[PDB]
Amino acid sequence: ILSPANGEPIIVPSQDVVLGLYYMTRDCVNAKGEGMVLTGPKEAERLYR
Amino acid sequence: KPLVGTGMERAVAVDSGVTAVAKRGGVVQYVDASRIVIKVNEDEMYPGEAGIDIYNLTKYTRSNQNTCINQMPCVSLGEPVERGDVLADGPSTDLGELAL
Amino acid sequence: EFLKPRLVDIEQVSSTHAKVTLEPLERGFGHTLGNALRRILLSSMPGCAVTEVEIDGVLHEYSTKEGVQEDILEILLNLKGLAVRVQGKDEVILTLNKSGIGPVTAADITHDGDVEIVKPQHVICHLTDENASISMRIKVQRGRGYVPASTRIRPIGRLLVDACYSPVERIAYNVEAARVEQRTDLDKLVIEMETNGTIDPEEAIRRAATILAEQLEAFVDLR
Amino acid sequence: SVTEFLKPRLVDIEQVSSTHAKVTLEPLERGFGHTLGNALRRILLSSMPGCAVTEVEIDGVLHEYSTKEGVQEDILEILLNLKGLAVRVQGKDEVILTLNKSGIGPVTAADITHDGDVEIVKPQHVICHLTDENASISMRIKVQRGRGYVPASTRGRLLVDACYSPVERIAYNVEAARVEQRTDLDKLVIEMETNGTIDPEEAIRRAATILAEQLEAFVD
Amino acid sequence: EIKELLKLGDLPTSGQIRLYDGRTGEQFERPVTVGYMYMLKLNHLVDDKM
């Protein structure tokens, strides 16, 4: 998983995987559910789904 | 046919020679999947002739790349046809338009 | 505790287009049932399709027949689009005999008591010679899903036709507000179905619900 | 044979924990994995009935963004902890639980005053922490029976988001499955975590039962 | 002109419509460009290459 030329990883996501992570980790100013306080990631997934 | 075209499809289809093009105007006297018989108009007749044009269609013959070359008529019985009109579509042609 | 939906209306817009209303539905159940029924209706509905054709004097589809406008392959493609409902049997042989100039359509197929032609004007081919005549035996089989001929395992002249058994062409569903006697949080689900005219919309809905319930029987008692 | 479909032959239930299960069903008809998984997921997320904390009355606190001396956590964190309280209210739909604690230490679910028809799933669930010897906390918790998840935004009476459904997490995946020749089949893997009032298997059975009873007016 | 023709057919002028996921029925969060593209099958079939 590391490049022999420079030691950097070769398996970095590209294109649509990067787009998906970027879209899901973006923030919106007045998105639905703003200001909620969640017990954890499971509650966040339940609310989103 | 391409829903979005440039207008060059007809020229490509006709000039390629893969389609059957009416040599003279007339009326479709007979038609089937292998043949077209045109009853030539009186004004396009040479004096000593019947006025019948016969177009035998190429049916399911291999191309140089083993693709199918097949001509099917695009005119019906009794239809009037003019000179230069497409009588039978060739491979990748739709009503005289290139259809890739 | 949950209110159970009921089939309350069937608007037969056309012979091949219908709307089925399920009412009442609680929150979330409208979309759940809508998507489940849409998937089951699109994937699993049974129907009758043409599977084998025997045209007299024809050895294979890559050929022409004198006096016929269409190629044999195009005739097979047209027969693939023939919509037929068969009663009381899973396989039938229809006979088509036609002579003289004119369009040979589904109406010219020999009448069978257990076979109904939903679209008699379906064009099968065109005869262009007065002395031309066409005679074929068409095999119609009941099935479901898509079954290609190449994946299907015969005298020469028996031409195999890819079988698209599914009578359902398009499914849409809309969940909207329902007017109840005392409740306001109830929805109704309108399922718009476009078929080939060979399946009853209520029969299709009950069929899909039965398929879903039988598939749910495994989860109902998990072990 | 057009009216018969493949039924799950292999059903493997891996118990990752007491409240965490992985149910693998194989084989399924093409596309049936997504159908069943999505339907069960929607029912478990939004339709499962259950009891959950809906309100709390805390003495000294009048609104959410307030403070209370002697309590290590903030009032918002106390609300968050109350949200996680899994309670089995067998007797009624609406119940009020009194919680009266004093002295330094962790105020947990076990310190809530006992009720005959109320069961605490996790008595060691931490409500808050008291950091002073003379610190005291007096609260009345209104726990109601409802369906799914009801946020407090859609509704000093402190409002807690109502997690009625005992489902903590529900996910499903569809993998390629195969029988003698057929290779396009579906294998449904359901990964589910519950809040401990009911175990994942019973919750899946209840969701399936609810979905099946929804169809009783159309099943032959 | 394309948007005018879209108006004539009672279609959105942006060329983007609301799509739903067939697997779940969930609406896709943003409008999706949906239209008709003229597609060609090239003479590079996997049958000839495998």
From Swiss-Prot, chain A:
Oligomeric form and interacting partners: The RNAP catalytic core consists of 2 alpha, 1 beta, 1 beta' and 1 omega subunit. When a sigma factor is associated with the core the holoenzyme is formed, which can initiate transcription. The rRNA transcription and antitermination complex (rrnTAC) consists of RNAP, NusA, NusB, NusE (rpsJ), NusG, SubB, ribosomal protein S4, DNA and precursor rRNA; S4 is more flexible than other subunits.
Source species of the chain: Escherichia coli (strain K12)
Outcome reported for the amino acid change (mutating residue 15 to P): Resistant to antibiotics salinamide A and B
Protein name (record): DNA-directed RNA polymerase subunit beta'
Similarity annotation: Belongs to the RNA polymerase beta' chain family.
Main function: DNA-dependent RNA polymerase (RNAP) catalyzes the transcription of DNA into RNA using the four ribonucleoside triphosphates as substrates. Resistance to the antibiotics salinamide A, salinamide B, rifampicin, streptolydigin, CBR703, myxopyronin, and lipiarmycin can result from mutations in this protein.
Post-translational modification, as annotated: Acetylated on several lysine residues in the presence of glucose.
Reported uses of this protein in biotechnology and industry: Co-administration of salinamide and rifampicin or salinamide and myxopyronin suppresses the emergence of resistance to both antibiotics.
Swiss-Prot record, chain C:
GO annotations of cellular component type: cytoplasm; cytosol; cytosolic DNA-directed RNA polymerase complex; membrane; transcription elongation factor complex
EC numbers on record: 2.7.7.6
Keyword field: Acetylation, ADP-ribosylation, DNA-directed RNA polymerase, Nucleotidyltransferase, Transcription, Transferase
Catalytic activity, as annotated: RNA(n) + a ribonucleoside 5'-triphosphate = RNA(n+1) + diphosphate
Record keyword Nucleotidyltransferase present: yes
GO biological process: bacterial-type flagellum assembly; bacterial-type flagellum-dependent cell motility; cell motility; cellular response to cell envelope stress; DNA-templated transcription initiation; intracellular iron ion homeostasis; nitrate assimilation; regulation of DNA-templated transcription elongation
Molecular-function GO terms, alphabetical: DNA binding; DNA-directed RNA polymerase activity; protein dimerization activity
Keyword Transcription included in the entry's annotation: yes
UniProt PTM comment: (Microbial infection) ADP-ribosylated on both alpha subunits by the phage T4 protein ModA. ADP-ribosylated on only one of the alpha subunits by the phage T4 protein Alt.
Region feature Alpha N-terminal domain (alpha-NTD), mapped onto this chain: 1-223
Role noted for this protein: DNA-dependent RNA polymerase (RNAP) catalyzes the transcription of DNA into RNA using the four ribonucleoside triphosphates as substrates. This subunit plays an important role in subunit assembly since its dimerization is the first step in the sequential assembly of subunits to form the holoenzyme.
Oligomer status and interactors: Homodimer. The RNAP catalytic core consists of 2 alpha, 1 beta, 1 beta' and 1 omega subunit. When a sigma factor is associated with the core the holoenzyme is formed, which can initiate transcription. Both the N- and C-terminus interact with different regions of transcriptional regulator CRP. The rRNA transcription and antitermination complex (rrnTAC) consists of RNAP, NusA, NusB, NusE (rpsJ), NusG, SubB, ribosomal protein S4, DNA and precursor rRNA; S4 is more flexible than other subunits.
Curated annotation (Swiss-Prot), chain E:
Protein's job: DNA-dependent RNA polymerase (RNAP) catalyzes the transcription of DNA into RNA using the four ribonucleoside triphosphates as substrates.
Modified residues (N6-acetyllysine): 7
Biotechnological exploitation: Co-administration of salinamide and rifampicin or salinamide and myxopyronin suppresses the emergence of resistance to both antibiotics.
Superkingdom in the source lineage: Bacteria
Family affiliation: Belongs to the RNA polymerase beta chain family.
UniProt name for this protein: DNA-directed RNA polymerase subunit beta
Name of the encoding gene: rpoB
PTM remark: Acetylated on several lysine residues in the presence of glucose.
Assembly, per entry: The RNAP catalytic core consists of 2 alpha, 1 beta, 1 beta' and 1 omega subunit. When a sigma factor is associated with the core the holoenzyme is formed, which can initiate transcription. The rRNA transcription and antitermination complex (rrnTAC) consists of RNAP, NusA, NusB, NusE (rpsJ), NusG, SubB, ribosomal protein S4, DNA and precursor rRNA; S4 is more flexible than other subunits. In pull-down experiments interacts with CedA.
